[PDB]
């Protein structure tokens, strides 16, 4: 039984792409098949941001962020509840969930 419209990745005219490595795993999943994440994280999220700011010598100093990205294998991503399964009638929904915060 064929499952999807595509083959499950972003290979449609190439045949082979470069392999990448997972973060919590080490599987050599291809780049067009894996799951990426462009996460933005501050140095202090909500824990002691006022304690950091009031201890700062420089007036009007803003904390920087950490723009790092991670690569997940499919089993590693489904174990960490990153992606979730759904039904067949809504499986053709490429649109991401909405962003608010």
């Amino acid at each position: 039984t064929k499952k999807r419209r595509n083959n499950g990745r972003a290979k449609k005219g190439r045949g082979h792409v470069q392999p990448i490595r997972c973060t919590n795993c080490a599987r050599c999943v291809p780049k067009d098949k894996a799951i990426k994440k462009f996460v933005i994280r501050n140095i202090v999220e909500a824990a002691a941001v006022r304690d950091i700011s009031e201890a700062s010598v420089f007036d009007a100093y803003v904390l920087p962020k950490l723009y790092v990205k991670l690569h997940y294998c499919v089993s590693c991503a489904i174990h960490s509840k990153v992606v979730r399964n759904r039904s067949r009638e809504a499986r053709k929904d490429r649109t991401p969930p909405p962003r608010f915060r």
Partner: protein, 136 residues
């Protein structure tokens, strides 16, 4: 053993490295040039249990040790230099760096520019493991 800088005029500025992996926490402090050090402390200094090597309490105790050492030496303002693991293993640091920095800010020191000095490669050699991964 004592510095000629006055505690009423301005504050001195050193740099301190924090290396915070998923199972180890280093808190090291050196001079501004980085040639010579001041003191150093790991997570597993007083807590002899291995399981607390990556814990908020060990990082908090390490930051208190740096706090007491820098207060008896007279070092007030610090630049925090954060390192996650180094190399091609991971990129996101653990939760020990957060507790170490908030315990440094809790004691009473002053902070300046903070940044990340993680040795990011262009791309390194083969990762420690196999093709199928570190399954468990």
């Amino acid at each position: 053993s004592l510095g000629p800088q006055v505690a009423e005029g301005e504050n001195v500025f050193g740099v301190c490295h924090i290396f915070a992996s998923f199972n180890d926490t280093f808190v090291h402090v050196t001079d501004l040039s980085g040639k010579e050090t001041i003191c150093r402390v790991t997570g597993g200094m007083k807590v002899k249990a291995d399981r607390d090597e990556s814990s908020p309490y060990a990082a908090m105790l390490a930051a208190q040790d740096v706090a007491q050492r820098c207060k008896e030496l007279g070092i007030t303002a610090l630049h925090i230099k954060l390192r996650a693991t180094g190399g091609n293993r991971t990129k996101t640091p653990g939760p020990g760096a957060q507790s170490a920095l908030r315990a440094l800010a809790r004691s009473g020191m002053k902070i300046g520019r903070i940044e990340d000095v993680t040795p990011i490669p262009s791309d390194s050699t083969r990762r420690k493991g196999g093709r199928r991964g570190r399954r468990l």
